[PDB]
Amino acid sequence: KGIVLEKLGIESKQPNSAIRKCVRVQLIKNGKKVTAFVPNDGCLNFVDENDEVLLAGFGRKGKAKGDIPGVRFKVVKVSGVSLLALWKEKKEKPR
């Protein structure tokens, strides 16, 4: 689990860039704060600040044209619901 501490690249002009997609997240077990990817850049609207993101390993098999060394996690569930079920508009985020 983790707390969304802030967003990164919210003022980055170049859209869909990787630094646009990355939020900065504090974990609740340690206290250590890391960075986390997010699929589908529109899904930055779903995470706000003090959400509970549930992070999973990013575990990427390969590295693309303009990627980032350093993002190692990825956001799976934002405050209970799951980002595939908000982006697909099945459920919606219970505040």
Partner: peptide, 27 residues
């Protein structure tokens, strides 16, 4: 004057964010 001050804001903000993602990972 506007276009300049935008360029220095944008450069600083971008570089600093990349520096934070360089500040985390080989810890």
């Amino acid at each position: 004057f506007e276009a300049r001050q935008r360029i220095e804001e944008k450069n600083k903000e971008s570089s600093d964010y990349h520096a934070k993602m360089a500040h985390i990972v080989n810890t």
